[PDB]
Each structure stands twice: as C-alpha cells, then as structure tokens.
Amino acid sequence: RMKXIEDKLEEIXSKXYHXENXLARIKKLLX
Amino acid sequence: RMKXIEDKLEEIXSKXYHXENXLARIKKLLX
Amino acid sequence: RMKXIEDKLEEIXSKXYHXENXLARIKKLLX
Amino acid sequence: RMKXIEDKLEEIXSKXYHXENXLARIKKLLX
C-alpha cells in the first residue's frame, strides 16, 4: 500500500530521468 | 484513500505516455 | 496526511495542464 | 511512510521547476 506507492513514486522519479534526457535530445536537435 | 492515491499515480503514469509521445511530436517537427 | 497527499496529486495533475499547454507553446513555435 | 511520500511529492513538485525552466531553455532556443 505505502511501499508498493513509494516504489510508483521511485517509476515517476524514472520518468522525470527520461523528462530530462527527452529535453536534453531536443536541446542538443536545436545546440 | 490508498487505492483511489495509487489509481492518481496510475493518471500520472497516462501523463508521463502523453510527456513521451508530446516530445516524440516535437522530435519527429525537428527529425 | 492522505488528503493533504491526494490534494499534492491534484498540484501535479496542474503541472501535467501547464506540461501539455509548454508543449502545445513549443509545437505551435515549430506549427 | 506518509511524510517521507509527501516529502517524494515535494522532489516531484523540484522536477515540475526544472519541466518549466527545460521548456522556458527550449522556448528562449526557438524566442
């Protein structure tokens, strides 16, 4: 319940890596 | 409480699909 | 505790509006 | 449990700063 929430939060804290490195893809398409 | 949280987390884990496929829209505007 | 979490989740479900409409800013900079 | 969740939520509410200011990087690459 709480651990299997905190361990969705640590998927989101993956999505906010893959957010960053999407954007840094785009920024290095634009230098 | 916990399930109707985990089931917001599984909306966010939709938003982080629609994040990805927004960016992959942009990347394929830029190839 | 649970309500003042669910009501952070409904800030994030604002950020994922302002995600979308950031990107749709960018897409309509690119048409 | 609940506080060490709410205090992941306040990391995500950092990621959704660094989301915004990524995009505003990109927008000011595009003016």
Q: Which two tokens stand for residue D28?
A: 């000011």
**How far is A5 from A30, CA to CA, in rounded Å?**
37
Determination approach: X-ray
**How far is D19 from A14, CA to CA, in rounded Å?**
14
**How far is D5 from A3, CA to CA, in rounded Å?**
9
Q: What count of Cα atoms within 13 Å lies in the side-chain half-sphere of residue A28?
A: 6
Interface A-B: count of C-beta contacts within 8 A: 38
Would you tell me which residues 1-30 of chain C have a C-beta closer than 8 angstroms to some C-beta of chain B?
A: 2, 5-6, 9-10, 12-13, 16, 19-20, 22-23, 26-27, 30
Task: Report whether B27 contacts A25 (CB < 8 A).
Answer: yes
Q: What is the distance in angstroms between the Cα of D17 and the nearest Cα belonging to chain A?
A: 11
**How far is A12 from A28, CA to CA, in rounded Å?**
24
**How far is B23 from A29, CA to CA, in rounded Å?**
12
Task: Compare all CA atoms of chain C with the CA of B26 and give the residue at the minimum distance.
Answer: C27
Among D12, C26, C28, which Cα is nearest to A22's? C26
**How far is B30 from A3, CA to CA, in rounded Å?**
40
Measured in degrees and rounded to the nearest 5, phi and psi for residue D30 equal -105, 5
| Per-residue H/E/C for chain D | CHHHHHHHHHHHHHHHHHHHHHHHHHHHHCC
